[PDB]
Design an enzyme around this catalytic site. Structure first.
Site, short mmCIF file in Angstrom:
data_model
loop_
_atom_site.label_atom_id
_atom_site.label_comp_id
_atom_site.label_asym_id
_atom_site.label_seq_id
_atom_site.Cartn_x
_atom_site.Cartn_y
_atom_site.Cartn_z
N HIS A 137 45.16 38.96 41.81
CA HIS A 137 45.09 37.51 41.67
C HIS A 137 46.45 36.87 41.40
O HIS A 137 46.57 35.65 41.53
CB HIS A 137 44.13 37.13 40.54
CG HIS A 137 42.69 37.40 40.84
ND1 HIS A 137 42.13 37.18 42.07
CD2 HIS A 137 41.70 37.87 40.05
CE1 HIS A 137 40.85 37.51 42.04
NE2 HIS A 137 40.56 37.93 40.82
N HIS A 176 36.06 40.19 43.38
CA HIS A 176 36.75 38.91 43.48
C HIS A 176 37.71 38.93 44.66
O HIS A 176 38.19 39.98 45.08
CB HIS A 176 37.52 38.60 42.20
CG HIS A 176 36.67 38.54 40.97
ND1 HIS A 176 36.33 39.66 40.24
CD2 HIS A 176 36.09 37.49 40.34
CE1 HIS A 176 35.58 39.30 39.22
NE2 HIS A 176 35.41 37.99 39.26
N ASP A 267 34.08 46.18 39.74
CA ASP A 267 33.11 45.15 39.37
C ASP A 267 32.16 44.81 40.50
O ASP A 267 31.27 43.97 40.32
CB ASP A 267 33.84 43.89 38.90
CG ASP A 267 35.00 43.51 39.80
OD1 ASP A 267 35.17 44.15 40.86
OD2 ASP A 267 35.74 42.57 39.44
C1 LIG Z 1 41.63 42.50 39.81
O1 LIG Z 1 41.31 41.72 38.70
C2 LIG Z 1 40.03 42.00 38.23
C3 LIG Z 1 39.09 40.79 38.61
O2 LIG Z 1 39.19 40.47 39.96
O3 LIG Z 1 37.78 41.10 38.28
C4 LIG Z 1 39.68 39.64 37.77
C5 LIG Z 1 38.96 38.29 37.98
C6 LIG Z 1 38.43 37.64 36.67
C7 LIG Z 1 38.42 36.08 36.65
C8 LIG Z 1 37.00 35.46 36.45
N1 LIG Z 1 36.87 34.68 35.18
C9 LIG Z 1 35.45 34.48 34.75
C10 LIG Z 1 34.85 33.14 35.28
C11 LIG Z 1 34.77 32.02 34.20
N2 LIG Z 1 35.51 30.80 34.61
K LIG Z 2 38.11 41.81 47.09
ZN LIG Z 3 37.30 41.61 40.17
#
Ligand SMILES: COCC(O)(O)CCCCCNCCCN
Ligand SMILES: [K+]
Ligand SMILES: [Zn+2]
Ligand SMILES: [K+]
Length: 639
Positions: A137, A176, A267
């Site tokens: 990200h 994600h 995840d």
């Molecule tokens: C590779 O990074 C690991 C990941 O992709 O899971 C990180 C994303 C988390 C961001 C999501 N926040 C929760 C939503 C509430 N607004």
């Molecule tokens: K992905």
């Molecule tokens: Zn993720």
């Protein structure tokens, strides 16, 4: 020449954590790293991996994908107190900073580069880095989604400069969308980025319009960015495998990458509170396995997401198991993908049809949650058994052996002969059938032998003893035959599926037979399309207990045979018996090399298949996708 697998890890990367109340960030805990490594030690796979030390990424290396202003701002976080860290974290979306996070971020970045160096220097064949914080990200001048520095983006840019690489594949199976990687290589045709992700029609974080299937790249790089949005939760193993067979793999093998980097976020597995998908950890043993024929096995797995500590540990072990060459577990219950997944798959293939020749035919007319624990993966005592013709010495890999027939097996070959073929005295044939039973008994029963290859002279009698002996030890047998004759194989009871590669086209009526009459220049490209788009989908849904490969002596185009037996070892826990009619030192060495788990040479420049071939293959999909739903790559027409 590359040997084992590297596991890069360090306890220091777990020494930063969230220090204030933030419901969007409290799931990113240091225990993700502790549970992951402790699970590898429990299953004995950490001890089987080369522990390459971690290092700090230098300032010059960080600037490959980040700006000086952003690096200078993060560099002052170690001197900030808690209140100042709160104010700095509010400037970005869903990220927290710690006194030690800048230190760990350089370790997570340097650990990835250590893995890239170990793989590209042939010190290891592949490897995985259990790093933290994640990276996919992170953008050029911003932290985002628990990510400070883009680890995977570093690896691709680092491999380009220090190794002069032209083609790099990035597979992001995190739940994600790694928009930081997409922004980094948006105009770069040298880095092909694939990512599936929970989208829900832009209602899911990070809520980006460019996370949809329409973003295919920009400028010279258009067609080298592939987004596959999940518009509903609960995606299953069938959805994940349909994404690979009908989108990712046809593009990846046409791309022919020189290095594969995986944004391995778990995840997307069952039980994760952020992904809410329903894929079991065993699916990652196959997602890894289906990618390893690419780039001669040079694969770097970089940990990303994964927040269910139980599901994370299981998914990590399944990934390392496959990287170490352990047999893949059987996947049952496979079928068609859901309508939402088929709609996403249908849309991606349509937009990408103007860029990749695997989809080019689509452009014109006449085209607490609980799940069972995974079983124990175990490499056989000797992986491959080879039975050359009488009196042929061969140089075998360190994990192979030759055929002595015990008297218990010698009596069975007689009983088979006095009943069927009671006018058979060719003592050379009787030895081959004795070898077939001996190797099959060591495959199905004892966990000593995984697979094997036997050279035969008679085809009809050998395939009969091989098939009938496998259907009585326990269940389901898949047969892959490259020849033009007819074999004593009955696709009658639904216990046998026969894939036939021939020269003359035969009107197939049974939905348990798949006949591929491929036209001779582009027979390599057409075979790979049929392998990824037809053979693998039906084989995975059929879920066999044994794969029976048959090659008659008349069969030539052998450049694709290494890829088949490697990819087909994802079925039946790798239990595959190959019968080669006649002796061919090159073909026999190719079969034993791929059966043993060695790397396979890349196919090179993959051209475009003949329109007559893709027409024949799509007619086979129309004839079979109703029975075998995993073949579907479009939405079904409702009455
Ligand atoms: C590779 O990074 C690991 C990941 O992709 O899971 C990180 C994303 C988390 C961001 C999501 N926040 C929760 C939503 C509430 N607004
Ligand atoms: K992905
Ligand atoms: Zn993720
Ligand atoms: K790209």
């Amino acid at each position: 020449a590359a040997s084992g697998s590297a596991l890069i890890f360090d306890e220091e990367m777990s020494r930063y954590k969230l220090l204030w109340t933030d419901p969007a960030c409290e799931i990113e805990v240091p225990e993700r790293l502790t549970v992951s490594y402790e699970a590898l030690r429990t299953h004995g796979l950490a001890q089987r991996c080369k522990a390459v030390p971690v290092r700090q990424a230098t300032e010059q290396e960080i600037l490959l994908a980040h700006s000086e202003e952003y690096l200078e701002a993060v560099k002052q976080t170690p001197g900030m107190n808690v209140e100042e860290l709160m104010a700095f974290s509010k400037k970005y979306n869903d990220v927290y900073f710690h006194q030690n996070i800048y230190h760990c971020a350089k370790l997570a970045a340097g650990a990835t580069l250590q893995l890239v160096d170990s793989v590209m220097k042939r010190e290891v064949r592949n490897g995985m880095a259990l790093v933290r914080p994640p990276g996919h990200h992170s953008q050029r001048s911003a932290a985002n989604g628990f990510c400070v520095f883009n680890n995977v983006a570093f690896a691709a840019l680092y491999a380009k400069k220090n190794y002069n690489l032209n083609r790099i594949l990035i597979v992001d199976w995190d739940v994600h969308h790694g928009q930081g990687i997409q922004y980094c290589f948006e105009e770069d045709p040298s880095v092909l980025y694939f990512s599936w992700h929970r989208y829900e029609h832009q209602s899911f974080w990070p809520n980006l319009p460019e996370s949809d299937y329409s973003s295919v790249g920009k400028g010279k790089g258009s067609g080298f960015n592939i987004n596959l949005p999940w518009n509903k939760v609960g995606m299953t193993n069938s959805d994940y495998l349909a994404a690979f067979f009908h989108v990712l793999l046809p593009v990846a093998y046409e791309f022919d990458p020189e290095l594969v980097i995986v944004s391995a976020g778990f995840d997307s597995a069952i039980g994760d509170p952020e992904g809410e998908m329903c894929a079991l950890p065993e699916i990652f043993a196959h997602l890894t396995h289906l990618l390893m024929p690419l780039a001669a096995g040079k694969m770097c797995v970089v940990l990303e997401g994964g927040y269910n500590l139980t599901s994370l540990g299981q998914s990590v072990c399944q990934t390392v198991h496959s990287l170490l060459g352990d047999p893949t577990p059987r996947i049952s219950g496979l079928g068609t993908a859901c309508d939402s997944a088929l709609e996403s798959i249908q849309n991606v293939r349509n937009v990408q049809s103007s860029y990749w020749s695997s989809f080019k035919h689509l452009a014109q007319s006449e085209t607490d949650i609980v799940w069972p624990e995974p079983l124990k993966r175990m490499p056989a005592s000797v992986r491959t058994v080879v039975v050359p013709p009488p009196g042929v010495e061969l140089t075998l890999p360190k994990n192979c052996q030759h055929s002595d027939i015990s008297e218990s097996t010698a009596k069975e070959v007689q009983r088979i002969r006095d009943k069927h073929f009671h006018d058979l005295t060719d003592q050379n044939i009787l030895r081959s059938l004795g070898n077939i039973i001996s190797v099959l008994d060591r495959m199905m029963r004892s966990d000593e032998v995984c697979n094997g290859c036997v050279v035969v002279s008679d085809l009809s009698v050998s395939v009969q003893c091989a098939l009938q002996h496998a259907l009585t030890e326990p269940e389901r047998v898949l047969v892959v035959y490259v020849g033009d004759g007819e074999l004593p194989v009955k696709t009658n009871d639904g216990k046998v599926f026969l894939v036939q590669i021939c020269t003359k086209e035969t009107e197939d009526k049974c939905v348990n037979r798949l006949t591929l009459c491929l036209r001779g220049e582009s027979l390599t490209a057409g075979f790979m399309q049929a392998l990824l788009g037809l053979i693998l989908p039906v084989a995975y849904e059929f879920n066999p207990a044994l794969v029976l490969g048959i090659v008659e002596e008349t069969a030539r185009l052998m450049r694709v045979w290494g890829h088949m037996t490697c990819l087909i070892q994802g079925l039946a826990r790798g239990r595959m018996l190959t019968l080669l009619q006649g002796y061919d030192k090159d073909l026999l060495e190719l079969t034993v090399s791929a059966l043993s788990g060695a790397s396979i040479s890349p196919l090179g420049p993959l051209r475009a298949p003949k329109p007559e071939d893709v027409e024949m293959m799509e007619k086979q999909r129309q004839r079979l996708q109703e029975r075998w739903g995993l073949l579907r790559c479009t939405v079904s027409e409702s009455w």
